[PDB]
């Protein structure tokens, strides 16, 4: 092994001490940097929510004017009910986004402001704890220099007192009364001084070993426990907890707006399911009762006191009435066969139209995954054209059948099948 | 009963005919009015969605610039992960509202445009059917006038031929050969004429009864069936069905935007639940390994070839080392009792701080139902103040205990409890 003196031992120690001081400074720089990052995030969070509140108010105002626009230019009928509920949903959504903006401004932003301010306080105090820790550790490292130096001085004195003693022992067996006595008292004085010096050296070595033990314990405690604890117990005090609550306030606000919106959309879905042409027609006909009310039946009006009120089927008129009845009947048979054919065409075409207009083409889910028209329209048009043609035809046929049947039935009543 | 002539019967009939014509016109006015209402609703629906698309694009653009603002001013740590996901949610919501605007412009509005155009066609045709119906009905009512008039004329001829016959019968029993023959041929000519005229009258009455029957059947069919059918089969063709699909496209778009938003908010909720101070600390210490890495232990450095490396507890130094050991031990006992008391105060105060910062104050549900701060803050501050005081105290106590213990333990090793 090396034979080392004070200058070298001290310098080699000083090297590691300066390394530790350098590492302590860096630890402080890392901590400062992490604090500046937290302060910056909290500032970003404030600016993010301030701007979003503004965006939300704008949206809200625009939705309000959208609803007002149509609520100013003004019911029982199912499509108007859908419309009413559609406008109500806009009013509801407008209010909800104002509420959102208020929550951002009055609840969420102040939490970030408060946490920023608290973090300012907290980090100043945590850094003070940190500096106390580093100051005590440096104090301990700096105490070791003199402890070692004392051990080095006293050890050297012990070595050189041993030199002067051992030569005075070699000079003892040289002269071995006048001179023999004189070098005896000499080697005696050396023996005393060595003994004293060996003792001083032992005690200083013991001091050094004791101090070393305290030094390693201090270094270990700082690096293995105190740094970690400083972060957990000081720097991180309240941070994650506060951020959790602030962000859960955001989530609560959103969840509630979504629940309110869902409610609104469900009311529109109910209205849409209540779309009902025949019920709307009932409502219309009842509203305008007097428009649709049937007139009193026309009655036979006796002229100049006429006693008779029924068909007269006596001779000679009976034969011609029988002729007529038969005439009406066969003609009605032709017309009815023809009319049924037109009816069946009209009904089949109506079905086709129903197929066209009830096509389930409303699912727009594909539009939310991010990772020819004129020919069907012309076909529907031509189908509807043919439909109205057959409808007009059907109705004219029916109108003639109604008149002829009515006359036939009155004759049948009077005449019977056998007369 | 009244004895009525042609003028009165015709006028009373004409009155009810003019009533029916008047009611037919009103039916047409009601139908026109209902069509203008449908056309107007569909126009409102177009204008509503055109404006909402605009509102939605605006909102979308604003959200995009909100995200870009922060995505430009730029990780592993749990709070930064929450922030990242928060900005991602804005990007997602921006896109979803553009999609919404596209669906309004490219899908929903064209449906209302198309339905308006189709309704224009449909109503023109339905009105034609209506006019055919009303024209035929009016035709039938107008046919009855001549039928009645003929019955009135022939009935009158029958009455007055009966007059001239009956007097010629009274003049028969007057003269009852020259004159007797002359009035016989007279009453004969009357008998022929009456018989002829009674027959004409019967036939005209029969015609009238037949025509009446056809007239009442036509009126009934129109009022009880045709009007209702005209509405169902013509006016209402495709309307409710088309509106259903258009409005369900709206609902689908909304449902999908809500599902996408829900997904986004769930990802933020996951991040918030992953807020973890100790894990973030592990990550930090590992990132900056060389900042936090402990130095090599200080070793005993032998001076000028020193052979000894351990405590020397021989006499005379043993007694003083024993004295010292005991000295360290009793002092360590005092310090530890004191240090534990400070530790317990510090820990109880930490608990209080944890209670403060983890308060569940984030539910904002009450804000969506539409039908003192500085004192708790000063308390938290003073609690934190006291906490740092006790922390500094605790750590200084601990730092002394660490050094004294380390020296005590080395002595205990060398000396034992009995020496």
Swiss-Prot record, chains A, B:
Which residues are in the F-BAR domain? 18-280
Source organism's superkingdom? Eukaryota
Q: Which disease is it linked to?
A: A chromosomal aberration disrupting SRGAP2 has been found in a patient with early infantile epileptic encephalopathy. Balanced translocation t(1;9)(q32;q13).
How it assembles, according to the record, is: Homodimer. Heterodimer; forms a heterodimer with SRGAP2C, altering SRGAP2 function. Forms a heterooligomer with SRGAP1 and SRGAP3 through its F-BAR domain. Interacts (via SH3 domain) with GPHN. Interacts (via SH3 domain) with FMNL1 (activated by RAC1); regulates the actin filament severing activity of FMNL1 and actin dynamics. Interacts (via SH3 domain) with FMNL3. Interacts with RAC1; specifically stimulates RAC1 GTPase activity. Interacts (via F-BAR domain) with HOMER1. Interacts with ROBO1 and ROBO2. Interacts with FASLG. Interacts with PRMT5.
Present the record's domain note: The F-BAR domain mediates oligomerization, binds membranes, and induces plasma membrane protrusions.
Role noted for this protein: Postsynaptic RAC1 GTPase activating protein (GAP) that plays a key role in neuronal morphogenesis and migration mainly during development of the cerebral cortex. Regulates excitatory and inhibitory synapse maturation and density in cortical pyramidal neurons.
Protein name, per record? SLIT-ROBO Rho GTPase-activating protein 2
- What is the covered span of the full protein? 5 to 482 of 1071
